[PDB]
Amino acid sequence: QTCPSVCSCSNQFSKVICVRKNLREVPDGISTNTRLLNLHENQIQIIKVNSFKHLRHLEILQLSRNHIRTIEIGAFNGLANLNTLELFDNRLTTIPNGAFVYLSKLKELWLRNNPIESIPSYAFNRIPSLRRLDLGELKRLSYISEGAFEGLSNLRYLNLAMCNLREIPNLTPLIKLDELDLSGNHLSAIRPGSFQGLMHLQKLWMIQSQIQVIERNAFDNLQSLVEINLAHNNLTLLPHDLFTPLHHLERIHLHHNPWNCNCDILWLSWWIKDMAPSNTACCARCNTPPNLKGRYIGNYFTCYAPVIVEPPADLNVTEGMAAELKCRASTSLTSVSWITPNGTVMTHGAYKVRIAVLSDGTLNFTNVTVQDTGMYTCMVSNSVGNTTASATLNVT
């Protein structure tokens, strides 16, 4: 029933608009019937204890584009139905631990464009119901804890864009995570060790993250991945059959990158040709050589099959000793996959348990067994063709 003179209320009092009006303190006179409270573009700095105590039906609370520097402990007390909490473009130096405590309905929380210095351990743990979180545009960020995202087992969306981070933080407690945004950062090079534990992730955004190279078997852990955005990066080439373990993948964004078009970019060319339909996600163009510069991707030029440096030699060895099947390739780009006499195919990406394949392509054995004897074949694959090399192993 009650309405403040500064704020513009609606009939039945569900939407309370306080936009454009200048306010230094939180306006007193908000009705209990209120479901939406908009306080965008204001001069409010401190959110006092029990400021939204009587508001039990309030779902969306907009406290964006304000001068909010400090939030008290009992500030968000009394809000049982609060789902969305807008806190973007403020003066917050640190995340208030005592603020986000008793919220069962909270699913969305935006905190972008704030001068937040450090994210501490067990942050957002008191609010596990959260499904969407945005911690973007943190220009004054200097520290990220190990257990920073701990407790957020139900979170699906996370935005760590423009935080100027060099390495991917601990995103392991985010099991249900589907969408991740790491765009506009200072990410040097994507290593295979990174992104592990994000099995349920489908969308990844790495737009203008200053990436220079993507190492072999980097996106192998992201099995359920559907879309990757790697636009506006300093990438020249990609490793052969990188998107092969990613079965559910369909859309890849590779535009605005200095691509060096040659024999090694043919697998990516055929991916756009057949795997991608009438609608293509990217409009990628070459930078080097200058004669091919600015042309759209998608075998006229001279190309050759992969060449093996050292073929696997037949060796006689006894049980217990360490065995090796040497198979080096001419270029580091080629993907090496061994075929055991059992029938199973072993690659470099797989875990190094007993029988393993390293970067050079050598098949290393820790302990030789009876069942291991037979005929071993190595298949070196390139974006143009395939070459095989036969070997016989003797177990005594």
């Binding site: 972008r112 945005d134 203008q208």
Partner: protein, 326 residues
């Protein structure tokens, strides 16, 4: 270049010494007249819900013309600065959301500073900045702005920094204002000060080099002269080529402020400019007549019409109209 006529004392009598004139460069947006096509583009009737640039799931704020706090009329684009104008989200898919913002003047105006179009939500993936010297009859393109220049306009992506002193009048397509993950993520610029910098210099102290070229070359002088301006919007900020269909509320146009600074064309004959009957007109001096002082006043037709020149600095050549021969 503020004074027109000064009391001069000669050996034989005492008359006036005529010099080059130039009015003060001020915020021109106060004198323009905005035109939008389609005119129903401004959201309000019926009220619509929009999404901010920050998150695609951030859909809580709405637009309503009936309430002044939620209304976004085109008047806010020229408001003293933040207030912003907004367009209706493209509900009609796959019909291209094309908006034309015609900035009419009905007077010749020579630009002095960069045309800055500060946006509120995203920078368009396809945009053309247009001009007119014939009061809106024909349209000449100033600069093109796109995400992929070779695909959108069939041109090679260039920049003002890549241009030269001999290629100032060249029309280029830039990718500088395409991405939204850098500083100035919501600002579109039309480099005029940088185009003057090829002659004047990086410091802009040696104005004599710029002034000298403007008096000799007519085409260079006409390049900065405008009677009308147009913001040809083609595709809104989508980022990725593959556009969403279920949530069309994410895509729309939003302009915070437009910075159009310059002087009215007086052909170096006037300093005073009166905005009489909703139109800016030159208060003609040096015995000149017309809207831009382009014609000699009858009875002052001794020598043919010639505009004033800046050289020498500061007292430039006026080239005033002399009386007719009996």
């Amino acid at each position: 270049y503020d004074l027109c006529k000064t009391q001069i004392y000669t050996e034989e009598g005492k008359v006036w010494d005529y010099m080059a004139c130039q009015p003060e460069s001020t915020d021109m947006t106060k004198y323009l007249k905005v035109k939008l096509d389609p005119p129903d583009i401004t959201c309000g009737d019926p009220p619509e819900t929009f999404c901010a640039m920050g998150n695609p799931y951030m859909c809580n704020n709405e637009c309503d013309a009936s309430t002044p706090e939620l209304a976004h009329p085109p008047e806010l684009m020229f408001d003293f600065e933040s207030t912003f104008w907004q367009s209706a989200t493209w509900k009609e898919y796959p019909k291209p959301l094309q908006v034309n913002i015609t900035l009419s003047w009905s007077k010749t105006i020579e630009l002095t500073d960069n045309i800055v179009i500060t946006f509120e939500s995203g920078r368009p993936d396809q945009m053309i900045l247009e001009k007119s010297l014939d009061y809106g009859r024909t349209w000449q393109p100033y600069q093109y702005y796109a995400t992929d220049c070779l695909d959108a306009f069939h041109m090679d992506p260039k920049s003002v920094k890549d241009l030269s002193q001999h290629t100032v009048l060249e029309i280029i397509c830039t990718e500088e204002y395409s991405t939204g993950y850098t500083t100035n993520s919501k600002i579109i610029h039309f480099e005029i000060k940088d185009r003057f910098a090829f002659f004047a210099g990086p410091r802009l102290r040696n104005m004599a080099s710029l002034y000298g070229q403007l008096d000799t070359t007519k085409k260079l002088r006409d390049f900065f002269t405008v009677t009308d301006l147009r913001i040809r919007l083609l595709r809104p900020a989508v980022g990725e080529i593959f556009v969403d269909e279920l949530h069309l509320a994410r895509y729309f146009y939003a302009i915070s402020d437009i910075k159009v600074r310059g002087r009215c064309k007086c052909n170096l004959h006037a300093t005073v400019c009166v905005y009489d009957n909703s139109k800016l007109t030159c208060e003609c001096e040096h015995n000149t007549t017309g809207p831009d002082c382009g014609k000699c006043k009858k009875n002052y037709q001794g020598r043919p019409w010639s505009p004033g020149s800046y050289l020498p600095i500061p007292k430039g050549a006026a080239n005033a109209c002399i009386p007719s021969i009996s």
